[PDB]
Request: fold
Amino acid sequence: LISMTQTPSSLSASLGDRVTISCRASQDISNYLNWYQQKPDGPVKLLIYYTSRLHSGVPSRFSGSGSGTDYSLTISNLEQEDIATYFCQQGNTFPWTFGGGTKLEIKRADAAPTVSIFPPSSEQLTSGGASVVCFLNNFYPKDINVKWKIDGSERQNGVLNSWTDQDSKDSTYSMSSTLTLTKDEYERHNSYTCEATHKTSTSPIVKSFNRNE
Amino acid sequence: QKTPQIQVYSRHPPENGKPNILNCYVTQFHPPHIEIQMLKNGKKIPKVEMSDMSFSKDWSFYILAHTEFTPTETDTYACRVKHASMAEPKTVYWDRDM
Amino acid sequence: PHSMRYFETAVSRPGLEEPRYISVGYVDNKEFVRFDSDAENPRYEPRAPWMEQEGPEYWERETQKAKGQEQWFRVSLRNLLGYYNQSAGGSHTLQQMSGCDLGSDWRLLRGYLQFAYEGRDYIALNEDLKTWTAADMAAQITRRKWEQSGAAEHYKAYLEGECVEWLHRYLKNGLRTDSPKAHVTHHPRSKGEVTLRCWALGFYPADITLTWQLNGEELTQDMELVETRPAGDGTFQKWASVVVPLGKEQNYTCRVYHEGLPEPLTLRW
Amino acid sequence: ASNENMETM
Amino acid sequence: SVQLQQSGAELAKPGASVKMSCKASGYNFTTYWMHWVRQRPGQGLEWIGYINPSSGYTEFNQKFKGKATLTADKSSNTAYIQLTSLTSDDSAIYYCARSFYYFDYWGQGTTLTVSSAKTTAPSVYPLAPVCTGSSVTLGCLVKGYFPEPVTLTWNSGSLSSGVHTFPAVLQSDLYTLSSSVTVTSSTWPSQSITCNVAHPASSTKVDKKIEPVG
Reply:
């Protein structure tokens, strides 16, 4: 099967910029190369077919070029509605194959996460479970990492992580992490910490608490 | 009733004065009762072979008639199809381009 | 990934209380047996080389079955004639498609039993092999009757036993491919218009797709194309044509998709 | 191998 | 004026099969191939195969041969994908799309989730801080529900600035989501902040007030 590689998976741009996304096929595909846009919510529309042909409806700031094994899509004036994910697809030999991705995002200033920690609520405790919640809000860029420590000892099991998309207003990202364990383990341990790693500090951002105070 | 679709066509690419086979392929008709006459310059052609009739998932029937022939310059070949679904017997003439 | 179908036709003919009955068997869409009541001595006959190993008991059991089917369809034709309150001096058509699919785990994958009257759907067994779908109120008479007699269970027993058993036996014998040879011909049509005809010849199987593009854009909408047709020599033919401005022919490409092609063919004038 | 139908229509 | 309407979200038990539909309008259905495309959560697009509705002919990406079956009903202008022997690998979005070497027009997609979970109704926990900054952030933890979706608001939808509601995630076999809301330290606990969680599949409507010291 012909392999379609895009690079990269994420591209950062500003509104008004001339964005270019590239696609490379594992063999010559004779310009049978197409480009789709998948918006964050869902819908998938054809933008460019046959290397350079603009599908009807698509604004003319979308242009397509390439040959042999290298192809590219350019948007000449990046608008807000253009912040999306873009796929290439070869139509040369069966099976048809898609590129991996390239998702677009707005460029903004580095922001360190605002980190809040939350011990189990009283209700959950009475039910017999215990969840520690750590919010890491409005950081940039989006790469972040979270570590949980119980009494200085690292803890990976029982950990759920969720990530919002880029915020439409301030262009930041946020992440939520929940450490879940029984009421029994929780009540025999006292010291709980979540540690964030992010490009905005050489040391991790720490938030902790002791259950007995 | 459902009107038949007729195609008259050589098996191999035609060469003026060469052995060939003329096909009258009739499809998409119903009821299965149908009459197929292969004609050279209007006369009946004698030994004309009839494939056993079948039907498709349409329910509609199809059949292939054919005969050996040698097409030349001023020779005219046709297939006539009588079926109770059209206004009259359809006479489809052979075309080298089709 | 394997199938056996039987296609049955009964044609009630004005005069003589016997209607004509044809049955055709297929394995993987290749015809392997045929019965026709219009023969001097109507009998099931092999239509594939690999059916000549069966022996006389096979052929006599199957012929007896088809003579029963001939009586069954004769009576069902009379019944239907009554349901619709039709005249008896006409010609009428009853059709049947039935059989099974055998999966990769050697189990019954899907069963099929559907009938048509006068070329229109009449009653079909549903995928569950338990319930029927009737096209009109006459077919609902038949469906009440077949629910009463437990017809679906009996046919499910045939599907899960004799059908897949004999399909497996047949497969233990009866896989070829032939790429198309394609070319574009040119024909002066109107005064400043021509017809480009894209031909595909000599291919097998008959499944194929022909497309016309104008610098990549599909012209499916304003495209004329003929039904795939048998050459009569094992292979098939097809053509698709478009009407283009005289002089612009080189901006038009034909694209041929067929199983045996290592990649779709692209052609020009 | 064909099936012999039972109850008629 | 071409539209591909796909059937709604599916949800199915392991080992079952599903049939999803795609109805074509605005063009002659049998004159174009219908393609099917799969996207798993977080992944790209994969091509499954296509059907030619004229004949019913089907061709597939070899990895879906024993998984998918493609059919067309031309009396209703509708294509169908059937998946069998469902596992959690098959949970994804499935699109239908028109044409031959490019995909002219896409359906909206049908989401399929494969789970042996039963409808379960969340537990809703308020998250107050412990024990301090010009601002304070509170939370709402919505744990142990099935299926999606759940709607979460703050103060009945009035408080919407400074809110992050995070996508749901799978805990064992159920969903858990969380929402943070940041207000000024002078506004809480002075005024009332409450999360409202509605889980329509169980007719659930919880209001949980956020109380200090916690």
